[PDB]
Write an enzyme that holds these catalytic residues in place. Structure first.
Site, mmCIF file in Angstrom:
data_model
loop_
_atom_site.group_PDB
_atom_site.id
_atom_site.type_symbol
_atom_site.label_atom_id
_atom_site.label_comp_id
_atom_site.label_asym_id
_atom_site.label_seq_id
_atom_site.Cartn_x
_atom_site.Cartn_y
_atom_site.Cartn_z
ATOM 1 N N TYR A 118 89.768 29.532 -36.181
ATOM 2 C CA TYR A 118 89.042 30.759 -36.500
ATOM 3 C C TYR A 118 87.754 30.433 -37.240
ATOM 4 O O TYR A 118 87.650 30.642 -38.449
ATOM 5 C CB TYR A 118 89.946 31.636 -37.375
ATOM 6 N N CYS A 176 78.091 40.682 -34.595
ATOM 7 C CA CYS A 176 77.676 39.396 -35.143
ATOM 8 C C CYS A 176 77.138 38.482 -34.046
ATOM 9 O O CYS A 176 76.273 37.641 -34.297
ATOM 10 C CB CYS A 176 78.836 38.714 -35.875
ATOM 11 N N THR A 184 95.468 26.967 -48.464
ATOM 12 C CA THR A 184 95.216 28.252 -47.834
ATOM 13 C C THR A 184 95.725 29.353 -48.763
ATOM 14 O O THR A 184 96.604 29.105 -49.597
ATOM 15 C CB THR A 184 95.950 28.384 -46.477
ATOM 16 N N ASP A 194 91.979 19.530 -46.658
ATOM 17 C CA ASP A 194 91.384 20.601 -45.864
ATOM 18 C C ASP A 194 91.395 21.841 -46.741
ATOM 19 O O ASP A 194 92.457 22.406 -46.995
ATOM 20 C CB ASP A 194 92.209 20.911 -44.620
HETATM 21 N N1 LIG Z 1 89.594 30.241 -52.591
HETATM 22 C C1 LIG Z 1 90.213 29.734 -51.514
HETATM 23 N N2 LIG Z 1 90.993 28.602 -51.655
HETATM 24 C C2 LIG Z 1 91.619 28.081 -50.571
HETATM 25 N N3 LIG Z 1 91.587 28.536 -49.301
HETATM 26 C C3 LIG Z 1 90.804 29.666 -49.189
HETATM 27 C C4 LIG Z 1 90.103 30.313 -50.207
HETATM 28 N N4 LIG Z 1 89.429 31.419 -49.705
HETATM 29 C C5 LIG Z 1 89.739 31.388 -48.451
HETATM 30 N N5 LIG Z 1 90.553 30.384 -48.034
HETATM 31 C C6 LIG Z 1 91.083 30.057 -46.692
HETATM 32 O O1 LIG Z 1 90.013 29.617 -45.815
HETATM 33 C C7 LIG Z 1 90.358 29.982 -44.448
HETATM 34 C C8 LIG Z 1 89.269 30.832 -43.779
HETATM 35 S S1 LIG Z 1 89.458 31.049 -41.977
HETATM 36 C C9 LIG Z 1 89.127 29.380 -41.391
HETATM 37 C C10 LIG Z 1 90.392 28.566 -41.105
HETATM 38 C C11 LIG Z 1 90.183 27.123 -40.594
HETATM 39 N N6 LIG Z 1 89.355 26.358 -41.528
HETATM 40 C C12 LIG Z 1 89.532 27.167 -39.201
HETATM 41 O O2 LIG Z 1 88.466 26.566 -39.039
HETATM 42 O O3 LIG Z 1 90.082 27.824 -38.305
HETATM 43 C C13 LIG Z 1 91.703 30.696 -44.556
HETATM 44 O O4 LIG Z 1 92.737 29.710 -44.337
HETATM 45 C C14 LIG Z 1 91.715 31.208 -45.970
HETATM 46 O O5 LIG Z 1 93.035 31.540 -46.410
#
Ligand SMILES: Nc1ncnc2c1ncn2[C@@H]1O[C@H](CSCC[C@H](N)C(=O)O)[C@@H](O)[C@H]1O
Length: 272
Positions: A18, A254, A79, A55
């Site tokens: 995503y 977007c 996450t 990650d």
């Molecule tokens: N403060 C925080 N600490 C850790 N993870 C966070 C965060 N704010 C958002 N996220 C996480 O960042 C992600 C955004 S969506 C992107 C998901 C993945 N990196 C991809 O490329 O598909 C989600 O997993 C969300 O829960």
């Protein structure tokens, strides 16, 4: 609650990535372009077998799975999503590798373990400007002397509005932006390039590389929209017309913005 995962599976590719994909070849499918983006980001971390990769904001785990299988490294992912943490742990429990694999339901604010490299894709937009310094301080202090982090995030185009830069800023932008910050990035924020540079460098980071993927995001969004649309009935059945229209408006709107240059997506390579 958080939006059901069966909803996301209606438009995301099989790996459930995503974030902006990378169409190395114009003929790539969405899944191929998302795998291409994962390799692009990870290739910049000069991963070596046996290293540990963090990650930050791991989503449904495709990046960490790739890191293990293709680069043979140990991983750890953070996450804030209940559904993702469980999904990633199940994923981890199913695969077999002498590589260590951990997923934690907590923010980067609580992580304080030494890792070799870091990757963060599409998470930064949810942090909020007031926490930027903290994020860079934490990521910088966890990395080793030769550490590097790949920060992938949506950014606002620089001042090019001169002799260029569709200098339009009103309605068919301003209003939509509020919509995006309220529905898509609640408590989030879209940084300017100078700002990223600002906070990263102020903790000791050197920005050694930057790559824009503007047009790749426009096509990613188009494809997510096309998929969601084709699965309309099921989407409305599991959630509602309100949620459906909410997302279609987000994806189609977007797609136009990045295509017209109102927003961009950059990958920053930062070395400790
Ligand atoms: N403060 C925080 N600490 C850790 N993870 C966070 C965060 N704010 C958002 N996220 C996480 O960042 C992600 C955004 S969506 C992107 C998901 C993945 N990196 C991809 O490329 O598909 C989600 O997993 C969300 O829960």
């Amino acid at each position: 609650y958080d939006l059901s995962d069966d909803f996301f599976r209606l438009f995301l590719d099989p790996t459930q990535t995503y974030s902006c994909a990378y169409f190395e070849r114009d003929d790539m499918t969405l899944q191929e372009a998302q795998i291409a983006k994962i390799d692009l980001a990870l290739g910049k971390l000069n991963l070596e077998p046996g290293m540990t990769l963090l990650d930050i904001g791991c989503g449904w785990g495709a990046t960490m799975r790739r890191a293990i299988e293709k680069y043979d490294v140990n991983v750890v992912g953070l996450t804030l999503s209940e559904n993702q943490a469980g999904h990633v742990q199940k994923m981890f429990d199913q695969m077999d590798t002498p590589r260590s694999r951990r997923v934690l339901l907590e923010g980067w604010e609580k992580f304080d373990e030494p890792v070799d490299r870091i990757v963060s894709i599409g998470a930064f937009e949810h942090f909020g400007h007031q926490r930027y310094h903290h994020f860079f301080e934490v990521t910088h202090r966890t990395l080793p002397a030769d550490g590097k982090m790949l920060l992938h995030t949506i950014v606002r185009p620089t001042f090019k509005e001169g002799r260029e830069k569709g200098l339009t800023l009103t309605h068919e932008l301003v209003h939509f932006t509020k919509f995006i910050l309220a529905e898509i990035f609640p408590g989030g924020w879209l940084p300017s390039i100078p700002t990223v540079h600002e906070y990263a460098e102020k903790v000791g980071f050197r920005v050694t590389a930057v790559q824009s993927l503007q047009l790749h995001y426009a096509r990613t969004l188009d494809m997510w929209a096309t998929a969601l649309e084709a699965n309309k009935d099921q989407a409305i059945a599991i959630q509602s017309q309100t949620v459906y229209d909410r997302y279609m408006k987000y994806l189609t709107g977007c797609a136009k913005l990045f295509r017209q240059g109102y927003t961009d997506v950059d990958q920053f390579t930062l070395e400790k």
